[PDB]
Amino acid sequence: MFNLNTIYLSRIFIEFNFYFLFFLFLISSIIFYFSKIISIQNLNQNSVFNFLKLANIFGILISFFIHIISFWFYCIYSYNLSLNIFSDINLYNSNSIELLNNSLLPNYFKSNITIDFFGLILLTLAYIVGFVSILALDTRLYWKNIKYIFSFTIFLLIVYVYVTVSNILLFFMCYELLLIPSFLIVYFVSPSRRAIQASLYFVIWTQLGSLLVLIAISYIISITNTYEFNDLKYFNFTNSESTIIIFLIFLGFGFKAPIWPFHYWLTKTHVEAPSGFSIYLSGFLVKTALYGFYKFNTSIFIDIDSSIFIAICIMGVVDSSLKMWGQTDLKKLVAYGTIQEMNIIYLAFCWGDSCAILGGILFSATHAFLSALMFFLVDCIYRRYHTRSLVEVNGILHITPNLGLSILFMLVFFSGIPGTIKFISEFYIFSGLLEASPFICFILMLVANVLGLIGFSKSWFNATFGMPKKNTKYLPMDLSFKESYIILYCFFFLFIFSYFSSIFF
Amino acid sequence: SKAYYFVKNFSWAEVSNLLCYGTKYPTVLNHQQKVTRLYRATLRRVYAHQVEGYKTDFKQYNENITDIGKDFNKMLALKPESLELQAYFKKYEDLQEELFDPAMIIDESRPYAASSGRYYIFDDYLLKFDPFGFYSPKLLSENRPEEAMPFYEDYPQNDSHWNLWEQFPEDFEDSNAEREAILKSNK
Amino acid sequence: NYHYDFCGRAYMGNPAVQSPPKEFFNYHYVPDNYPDALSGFRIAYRDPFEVQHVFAYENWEYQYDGQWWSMGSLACNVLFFCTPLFLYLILQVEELNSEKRGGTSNKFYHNNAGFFHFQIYDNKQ
């Protein structure tokens, strides 16, 4: 019963949501530039900053709704396309349906849009995490950094082109564009003075991996003059070229997606970055690397043993889990948790295009939401209690019961209770790893889910419980409606996404 | 006494010093303090083991405390720098070690005891605290200005900047009536 | 068993009371930073010991070359250093079982001829 109307509606929605975002950004930027001689806030109720905040927030939100609709259309379209290809067995019949483009808006960068489930999951993560982070950064943007209210819109446009393109070069360029806005945010919006050095560490560490990926892309392009991302089927790389490409790709994308030993920059940046931008970084900016690694390694044929890469990922997991205990800083502890989860996700991609990719994608989504939740809780603690250190913070539950309850439920979700996409992703990865290498699976599970979990829980429980006798004149009140509903939405997603259609998982 | 013997990673020597004398450094104490504290500790332990114990014998308790009292009277009479007094101190410290009981009863009136901190008592600062006017009336003028200071609004509890431009009723009349009237009068 | 006098090489804070530190690393903010004013903008004076602990680890550093091996326990340090090698060797030994049986092996399988998971493959007129 599938008809061409659904196909064209899917394509039109995907194409036009990008232009909706772009036109919103363009209008907002034109207003901002041409309303004032100097593009800084006027400290009065009639400033354009209020309009810009409104436009950014409710462009992201409306584009997120349209993205939900377009993602559902894509799911139907992909399912029915697979059915059309698979169903017919007659040799004379073949599915050759050709679509003509609309005459209203042009194709951005003269590229035909191609959408995949992983790309749309990444785009949904971008939308939601960007919404949370923009909601967080309101107190940070003041009177000279208001120009960074558009950072998340720029991120959304970059990610949209990144996930809706079938061109290798455009793919790589979109991946590399993410550096400038993130560096500028960390440099100009971070309150702490150590953020200045943290930004440089972030730039250099990420750029080393960017150069590695650039070398790999140069190898692919120079050898294969193609750029369509599908002509690689008709060209085979020799053993030496293939091993060089996989090594470069893995190391370069692991610089971004933190792997052992390349997580020093991540720890520094998470500790010294804005509490609202740490959410976006951990939640989304480390998963574009995973998506790019998946695309490249599934496109290239590799005839090498992945034991070395699996060992690197497992070593990162073990290192982060063991170090969890020794952190009294909640933000650094959450950063180590992010490193652990990202290393597990990266390990999920070490078997080419096997079924491990499904667990990897689900784990990427759950880690995004869980890291957003954890960093937002740390943000609330730091903002109301003027410290994010375990020695200075104690007995949160008895003065701010809602915040303590949020911490406890965050710990329960992090533990991986059944009924959560966290548990589902752990089940996928461990079920595969048990047959792949059962002893390695046992070691990984033991370390991560006992030693790292206990180290993680020690600090959070100590902060939540106790007796806050110190500085009774300065104790805060409670979570606000904004914070409470953000926490509730994170919990709601982590719980209900387990009912998403199992066809794609 | 803080009753923190089994917490804070005390060594055995430190715990023994805490039990015998209230301090962890008995050297700081003088002769009378040492003797009196050791006598009190010995009597407390003998009472714990031979009065509040398992099938305690009160006659034996009386005899034991009498002997201990005579010995401690002799100890107090003795000079601080005497090997006999040192032997007495070692004897009664050994007795304290012998009678040492893990999970010994700790009175609920002492710090670090079971039930010591079950409740958090709220201070008058928290009791007075009421940023909104439901319980304690809130002035429309947020604060009372003090002399030699400007009049500034108090910082709100929630400092979210997600605020729209000022909203006005639909079809709100906002013509500059004052200027219009003055211009009409001027002609 | 751990005591400050006899730990020797397993370092820890000394039990003896000490005077508060006169100078210690402190929170510092970017120039012209916008203050954080949540819940009435009430800031309490920070405890010197607590602030010192907050900023001590970030600034801690090794005094002389090779101190890392000796610090703590040499055996545990060597085991931690060799952990990646142990993991790789365990993976290879496990992969021997996979090779001899016929189960999943550590390789980049290429069942799909570059066809991404549930990708839209279409042509235009």
């Binding site: - | - | 397993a10 820890m12 680890y57």
Partner: peptide, 26 residues
């Protein structure tokens, strides 16, 4: 019988740090 004063704030005694919190005891 006696009218007791309201429960003492002393019941929870504020703890004042007198020793450095060693990073080796984190």
């Amino acid at each position: 019988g006696w009218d007791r004063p309201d429960v003492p704030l002393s019941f929870n005694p504020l703890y004042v740090h007198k020793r450095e919190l060693s990073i080796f005891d984190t």
